[PDB]
Design an enzyme around this catalytic site. Structure first.
Site, mmCIF file in Angstrom:
data_model
loop_
_atom_site.group_PDB
_atom_site.id
_atom_site.type_symbol
_atom_site.label_atom_id
_atom_site.label_comp_id
_atom_site.label_asym_id
_atom_site.label_seq_id
_atom_site.Cartn_x
_atom_site.Cartn_y
_atom_site.Cartn_z
ATOM 1 N N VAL A 20 0.842 -1.195 0.000
ATOM 2 C CA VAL A 20 0.000 0.000 0.000
ATOM 3 C C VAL A 20 0.881 1.251 0.000
ATOM 4 O O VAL A 20 1.541 1.572 0.998
ATOM 5 C CB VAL A 20 -0.943 -0.006 1.224
ATOM 6 C CG1 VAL A 20 -1.872 1.209 1.190
ATOM 7 C CG2 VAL A 20 -1.759 -1.303 1.231
ATOM 8 N N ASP A 21 0.868 1.958 -1.129
ATOM 9 C CA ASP A 21 1.700 3.139 -1.332
ATOM 10 C C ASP A 21 0.930 4.436 -1.596
ATOM 11 O O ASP A 21 0.448 4.656 -2.713
ATOM 12 C CB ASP A 21 2.624 2.856 -2.516
ATOM 13 C CG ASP A 21 3.761 3.833 -2.619
ATOM 14 O OD1 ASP A 21 3.659 4.927 -2.031
ATOM 15 O OD2 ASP A 21 4.752 3.502 -3.304
ATOM 16 N N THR A 22 0.830 5.310 -0.597
ATOM 17 C CA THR A 22 0.106 6.563 -0.804
ATOM 18 C C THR A 22 0.913 7.547 -1.647
ATOM 19 O O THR A 22 0.356 8.491 -2.196
ATOM 20 C CB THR A 22 -0.273 7.260 0.531
ATOM 21 O OG1 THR A 22 0.908 7.512 1.305
ATOM 22 C CG2 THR A 22 -1.246 6.401 1.328
#
Lengths: 114, 115
Positions: A20-22
């Site tokens: 999960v990469d914002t």
């Protein structure tokens, strides 16, 4: 130090550990994962190797339409901000759980992390 | 089909700063430029790069301790997973707000985003 964020998802029944990469503009799937899941045949090479527009990703008990840009990489799936926003998610680090769509899945443990 | 990245306003030694929220980054970063301007570069534990172990960052009305790795970059402050976990935050994309420490602040609109 600092274990990264991962969640469990299933694509065409294949279990996958997703990062999960914002800070990433777009969601990505590895060419080899596209191969293994059979999604290779649905790759739109309209020009990175191509894009899979509305594949059905499974998170917990819900199938959600996710778009992937296929790249040759070691990361099988990278959930980017684009898809994070589309499904109005919440990266809850206090509850150490991801909340996306109408579902809520946990973050893999240091061990379960790939 | 672009999407505005995540940024929030913070203050470092009183200077207003637009900070990037990156869960994909393991370490929180502060640019050499900002460090030198704010003067925090004097606390750098080492061409002015190094490590700042403790610094009071102001988010909304609370001052919270953070660590930074100072590198020569364009982004003035990149808030990494390290600090997002230390302050048990929540990246609420439904409300376009960031809950960190014992506070809550919203993300900047494309117009407010630095360029």
């Amino acid at each position: 130090q600092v274990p990264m964020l991962y969640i469990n998802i299933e694509i065409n029944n294949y279990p996958v550990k997703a990062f999960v990469d914002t800070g990433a503009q777009t969601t990505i799937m590895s060419t080899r994962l596209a191969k293994k899941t059979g999604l290779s045949r649905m790759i739109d090479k309209r020009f990175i190797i191509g894009r899979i527009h509305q594949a059905q990703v499974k998170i917990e008990t819900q199938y959600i339409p996710c778009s992937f840009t296929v790249l040759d990489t070691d990361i099988d799936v990278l959930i980017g901000l684009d898809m994070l926003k589309r499904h109005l998610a919440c990266v809850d680090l206090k509850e150490n759980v991801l909340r996306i769509a109408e579902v809520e899945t946990s973050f893999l443990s240091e061990a379960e992390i790939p």
